[PDB]
Each structure stands twice: as C-alpha cells, then as structure tokens.
Design an enzyme around this catalytic site. Structure first.
Site, PDB file in Angstrom:
ATOM      1  N   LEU A  96       0.827  -0.967  -0.183  1.00 41.76           N
ATOM      2  CA  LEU A  96       0.045  -0.203  -0.079  1.00 41.76           C
ATOM      3  C   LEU A  96       0.698   1.194   0.066  1.00 41.76           C
ATOM      4  O   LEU A  96       1.927   1.377   0.124  1.00 41.76           O
ATOM      5  CB  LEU A  96      -1.148  -0.001   0.893  1.00 41.76           C
ATOM      6  CG  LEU A  96      -2.643  -0.646   0.448  1.00 41.76           C
ATOM      7  CD1 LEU A  96      -2.093  -0.946  -0.910  1.00 41.76           C
ATOM      8  CD2 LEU A  96      -2.949  -1.398   1.416  1.00 41.76           C
ATOM      9  N   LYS A  98       4.011  -3.039  12.435  1.00 45.64           N
ATOM     10  CA  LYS A  98       2.890  -3.057  13.435  1.00 45.64           C
ATOM     11  C   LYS A  98       1.744  -3.873  13.033  1.00 45.64           C
ATOM     12  O   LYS A  98       1.291  -4.847  13.688  1.00 45.64           O
ATOM     13  CB  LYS A  98       2.784  -1.719  13.907  1.00 45.64           C
ATOM     14  CG  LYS A  98       3.843  -1.329  15.009  1.00 45.64           C
ATOM     15  CD  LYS A  98       4.012   0.453  14.953  1.00 45.64           C
ATOM     16  CE  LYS A  98       4.979   1.233  14.425  1.00 45.64           C
ATOM     17  NZ  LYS A  98       6.190   1.356  15.143  1.00 45.64           N
TER      18      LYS A  98
HETATM   19 NA    NA Z   1       4.341   1.234  -0.394  1.00 45.24          NA
END
Ligand code: NA
Ligand code: NA
EC number: 2.7.7.7
Length: 327
Positions: free
Chosen positions: A54, A64
């Site tokens: 992303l 995390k």
């Molecule tokens: Na990325």
DNA sequence: CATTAGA
DNA sequence: TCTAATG
C-alpha cells in the site's frame, strides 16, 4: 468498514497518540493516511507484507500490522494505554479550553488531575476556568426535549429584540436527533450581508438579550460575529435545576444563510454527497454559497439563494426534509 | 478553516 | 505577532 477494522483502529490509536502525548505531527499524519488507505482496501489484510504494498504503508506500520495480526494486541499500544503521563494528557484535554499544548504543559507542572486543576485555578484562563467549572455538565448530552425548550426561548428574545432577525438552530437537532451535544444557533439579518460593512451590534444585541433574561450565563468568547458561551434553562419550581450547556450563536450575511444553514445542518455525508452531485449538475457548493461551474476548469459567480430549496432546485434534486438529511 | 484569546 | 483552542 469491518474487515479491516482492528487495523484501522489500532492505527488511529497510534496516530492520536503521536499527535497528543508527543508532538510528532508527521508520524501522526503518517498513521492517518495509512489508517485511511488500509480502510479502503477491499480485502482482509493477511499480513504486513500484503499491507505494505500500500501507499503510505511503510516498513514501520507494516511491522505493526504483523504484530497485531499475529497476537491479539500490540505492546506499544499496551505500554501507552498504561502510561500515566500520556494517560494524563488524554484526560486534561477533556477540559474545555485545554488542548494538547496546555495538557502537556500542565503535566509538566504536575497538574494531572481534576483536583490538581482546582488547586491551581490560577494557572487556568477564563475559558479553561469555565470548562473546569462545568466539567460534568459539559460532557453530558442534551435531550431534545430540552433542545426544544432552549430553542423556544431563544427564538423568543430573538424576536423581542428585532422582529427582522432570523435564527435557526442547526445540527443534529435540526436533523431530528434524540439528543445533542450543544446548541448551534445560526443568525442573520437583512441589514447584514456580504458587503454591508457589518453591524457588530447585530450580534451583540441578542447576546445581551439572552443574558438579560438569564439564558446566557457565561462568556467563553465573544466576537463581532461569533459568540461562544454557556446557558441554562430556568430551574423550575425547585428540586430540579438544569445542567450548564454550551451554546454558540453566529452572525451571518443574510445573503449567505441557506448555504450555511444547509451545511451546518449536515449530515457530514448528506453534505458531501449533495455536494458531490452539485459537481455533476455543473455547480459548486461550500459553506457560503453555490457557484456555477465553467468548463475552463473552474468558474465563479454566486447564484442567488432565498431558501434551502433554491440550492436544491439549482442542482435539480429532491428537497430533502432535514429529518432525512441523514445521508 | 476561520474566528477568538492571549501573552 | 504568533500560537493555541473551538467548531
Ligand atoms: Na508502498
Ligand atoms: Na479540551
């Protein structure tokens, strides 16, 4: 909305912390876009790695995500939730007038509690003095039943002072809402619009009105166009007094009302949505007006509004009763 | 995203 | 003046 929930929540928890207890504007902004993007994504994040593909998703957050994925938690999150200082700040902030900056500053001084605050009422400002004063009633909701009583009186003096006034009580209340947080009064007068060089008094007159009768009990802030205060309903024939309620009255050019009325009335989505549509319908809507779009890319020229309807007609939609302005 | 307080 | 705090 639910497939990526933990992720988004954990993330926002993370963001909110940097912002508040720390002054990490960026990290904070970091967690937010992430927490944003991850929320959009149509599938179950099955791993950081996955996440990571992303935009805004870095090594940092990805890391995390695994930890959360793997074990039902996160230490950093567990540590902070524990941390008294940080805890502190989160709390103090509830004080109206108390913001992050101050929050930390008080802490630093050692004012961590409600009581701490009292003991040092001197360290506080009038806003903050009042917040402090009405901490309980400030957090308490407002039953529509009361909204109704408040609204009534308000409209009453409004009228009394000058019959040429127009006040609308916007917000969720305006939208049917079984209860509200505070009362929002949008004000205007014909004798005030866009150009007509003010009439500060216009605002002033009413505030004074309201005080004179006891509705207004304190001043959080009074400017020439936007008053911000505290109010209370006449404690009846005893045994039951009313809680202190935040109130806000604002002046507006009669040539800007409806848009502003429409707008403040929401809901956030109703708005966004209606607004999205005005774009197609060759328009532009914003807190003050409604401009026709020009192909060149953009355009100006404020169309004339005399009702919530004009704006509707304009974008050729269905007049939506505020009741169902939910989305 | 603009208005107010304040220092 | 800037900076914080509300909405
Ligand atoms: Na990325
Ligand atoms: Na606060």
């Amino acid at each position: 909305e639910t497939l990526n929930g933990g992720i988004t929540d954990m993330l926002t928890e993370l963001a909110n912390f940097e912002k508040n207890v720390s002054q990490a504007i960026h990290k904070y902004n970091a967690y937010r876009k992430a927490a944003s993007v991850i929320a959009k994504y149509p599938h179950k994040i099955k791993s950081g790695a996955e996440a990571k593909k992303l935009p805004g998703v870095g090594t940092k957050i990805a890391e995390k995500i695994d930890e959360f994925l793997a074990t039902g938690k996160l230490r950093k999150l567990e540590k902070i939730r524990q941390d008294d200082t940080s805890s502190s700040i989160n709390f103090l902030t509830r004080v109206s007038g108390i913001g992050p900056s101050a929050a930390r500053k008080f802490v630093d001084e050692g004012i961590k509690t409600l009581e701490d605050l009292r003991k040092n009422e001197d360290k506080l400002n009038h806003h903050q003095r009042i917040g402090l004063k009405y901490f309980g009633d400030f957090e308490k909701r407002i039953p529509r039943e009361e909204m109704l009583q408040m609204q009534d009186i308000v409209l009453n003096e409004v009228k009394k002072v000058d019959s040429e006034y127009i006040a609308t009580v916007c917000g969720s209340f305006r939208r049917g809402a079984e209860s509200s947080g505070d009362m929002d009064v949008l004000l205007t007068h014909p004798s005030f619009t866009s150009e007509s060089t003010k009439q500060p008094k216009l605002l002033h007159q009413v505030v004074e009105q309201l005080q004179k009768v006891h509705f207004i009990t304190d001043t959080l802030s009074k400017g020439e166009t936007k008053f911000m205060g505290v109010c209370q309903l006449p404690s009846k024939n005893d045994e039951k007094e009313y809680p202190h309620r935040r109130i806000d009255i604002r002046l507006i050019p009669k040539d800007q009302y409806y848009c502003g009325v429409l707008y403040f009335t929401g809901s956030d989505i109703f708005n966004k949505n209606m607004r999205a549509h005005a774009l197609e319908k060759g328009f532009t809507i914003n807190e003050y007006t409604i401009r026709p779009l020009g192909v060149t890319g953009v355009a100006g020229e404020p169309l004339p509004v005399d009702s919530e309807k004009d704006i509707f007609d304009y974008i050729q939609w269905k007049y939506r009763e505020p009741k169902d302005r939910s989305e």
